[PDB]
Amino acid sequence: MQVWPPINKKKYETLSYLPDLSQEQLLSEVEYLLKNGWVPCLEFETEHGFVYRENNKSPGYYDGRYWTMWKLPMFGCTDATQVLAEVGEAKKAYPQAWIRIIGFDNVRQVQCISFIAYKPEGY
């Protein structure tokens, strides 16, 4: 029997409960996204790794959800490899950034996917 620790296990939604994704593994993801028609997009954050509630507490309001867009959604791209590139490209420049990869379904307007591509040091 073991006590799930109460202390350095901050999560990042989808896939954050499996072991660190290998680049191959990560590749599978961008691959899937693609397979489906989602436009891949990147957003990084260097200051508020997690939601807060400083400006408001009404129901549904949480500060810290929005992240910074890395360049633009790569519409038309089909090179899984090219987005991966980008990830590399951003840890260079924002080494302390948390970087994530998302997938837009433009017909439904929902982010059909999202998985963290890179935590900064000590996360």
Partner: protein, 464 residues
């Protein structure tokens, strides 16, 4: 008027059996599965169902001449034999728009299912489907929020949302409830919730439970760094009581409340959906009492209708069944209505029990919830049958884990991420299912503990 008033009885057939009829795009159509009484021609049974459902009674009344039944009469425009079935048919009835109060499922239900199910001339009646026209759909608010906004709010994408019903059903204290909540949530569940009969009782009062589960979910969200929520049950005995509770949840900043739509009722639900909309709470619908109506294939109302009705009155989530767990429910049918719950347009598909094309003219879709007697070993199936746009709930399956809630949570969260990646890498949750969680059981101590425990459990029993 026109044609003298001639007092006296006449068969229904004469006015409500209209095979001639050409449905209007604004008509409400209904597929009733009728089983008459011995000497009753189907077209009479069929005409009674349509008459006594719209404009007519059992004898001739002069007043008809004051208006015009051609405009108002409900009409049986076709019967069909139920292949390989005991004098059982499909009577199709069409109801002109003018007959229904806008915005009101209550009204719609009062008409279509008001009195006809007890006719002496019928021995059993069952409504299978209703075609809601766009002209009627546009008069409803529908879900406070729907799938996309819910995701957008909680910031959660790609994979089923996970949840757990605290147990025991009744008997836990305000405080234990909180404890249990926090413990399940920090583990990695997205939501915990009140059992559908946890309202406000001598053992635990709603205001006490609400205050402590708020404390707890807030603790669990800070800890994990992932938005959490606990469904707080607002079902009450009076609308005033009901709103009053929803109002507190709002005071606390919590994100979702819950309501037993059938025991509460459509009139009360509709009110809560409006209150949620204006106040920004997500509302979880629980379908208690439903199987009282939707089980027997020969009498009652089919769930696909109950489900439609809710996307109309209001709800962000609705319990859709599990196929694979403790309560009844077949796969094809479920698939059918789940599309009725989430899609914009659903094409007619008798295979799956959908008798009419449903166009929802952009009414928000509702997130189906898979709950009841399901565990770790079902993960890949649920994942398969339902897709990411679903909520999967672990009651027994969370508080039932050998090391307690936190661990029991972690087990499920891994089981599912596991299945999700298998899927994404291209594995086949249906064939390859079993290895996948089996595989993951190996790398996860909490997942393992789980696997061992519920390995041999299934709820195979020949369905109704």
């Amino acid at each position: 008027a026109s044609v003298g008033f001639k007092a006296g009885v006449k068969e229904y057939k004469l006015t409500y059996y209209t095979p001639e009829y050409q449905t209007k795009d604004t008509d409400i159509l209904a597929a009733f599965r009728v089983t008459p009484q011995p000497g009753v021609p189907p077209e009479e049974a069929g005409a009674a169902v349509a008459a006594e459902s719209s404009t007519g009674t059992w004898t001739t009344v002069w007043t008809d001449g004051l208006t015009s039944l051609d405009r108002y009469k409900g009409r049986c425009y076709r019967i069909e034999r139920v292949v390989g079935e005991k004098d059982q048919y499909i009577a199709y009835v069409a109801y002109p728009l003018d007959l229904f109060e806008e915005g009101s499922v209550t009204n719609m239900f009062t008409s279509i299912v008001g009195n006809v199910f007890g006719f002496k001339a019928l021995r059993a009646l069952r409504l299978e489907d209703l075609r809601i026209p766009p002209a009627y759909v546009k008069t409803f608010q529908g879900p406070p929020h729907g799938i996309q906004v819910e995701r957008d709010k909680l910031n959660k994408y790609g994979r089923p949302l996970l949840g757990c019903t605290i147990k025991p059903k009744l008997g836990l204290s305000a405080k234990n409830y909180g404890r249990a909540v926090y413990e399940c949530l920090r583990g990695g569940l997205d939501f915990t919730k009140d059992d559908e009969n946890v309202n406000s009782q001598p053992f635990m009062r709603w205001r006490d439970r609400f205050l402590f589960c708020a404390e707890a979910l807030y603790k669990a969200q800070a800890e994990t760094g992932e938005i959490k929520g606990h469904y707080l049950n607002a079902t009450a005995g009076t609308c005033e009581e009901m709103i009053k509770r929803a109002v507190f949840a709002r005071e606390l900043g919590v994100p979702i409340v819950m309501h037993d739509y059938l025991t509460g009722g459509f009139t009360a639900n509709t009110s809560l959906a409006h209150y949620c909309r204006d106040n920004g709470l997500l509302l979880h619908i629980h379908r208690a009492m439903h199987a009282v109506i939707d089980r027997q294939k020969n009498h009652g109302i089919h769930f696909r209708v109950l489900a439609k009705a809710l996307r109309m009155s209001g709800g962000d989530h609705i319990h859709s069944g599990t196929v694979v767990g403790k309560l009844e429910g077949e796969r094809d049918i479920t698939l059918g209505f789940v599309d009725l719950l989430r899609d914009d347009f659903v094409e007619q598909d008798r295979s799956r029990g959908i008798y009419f094309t449903q166009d929802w003219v952009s009414l928000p879709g509702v997130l189906p919830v898979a709950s009841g007697g399901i565990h770790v070993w079902h993960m890949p199936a649920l994942t398969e049958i339902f897709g990411d746009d679903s909520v999967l709930q672990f009651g027994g399956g969370t508080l039932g884990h050998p090391w307690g809630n936190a661990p029991g949570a972690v087990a499920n969260r891994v089981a599912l991420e596991a299945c999700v990646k298998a899927r994404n890498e291209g594995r086949d949750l249906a064939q390859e299912g079993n290895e996948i969680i089996r595989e993951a059981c190996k790398w996860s101590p909490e997942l393992a503990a789980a696997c061992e425990v519920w390995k041999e459990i299934v709820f195979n029993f020949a369905a109704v």
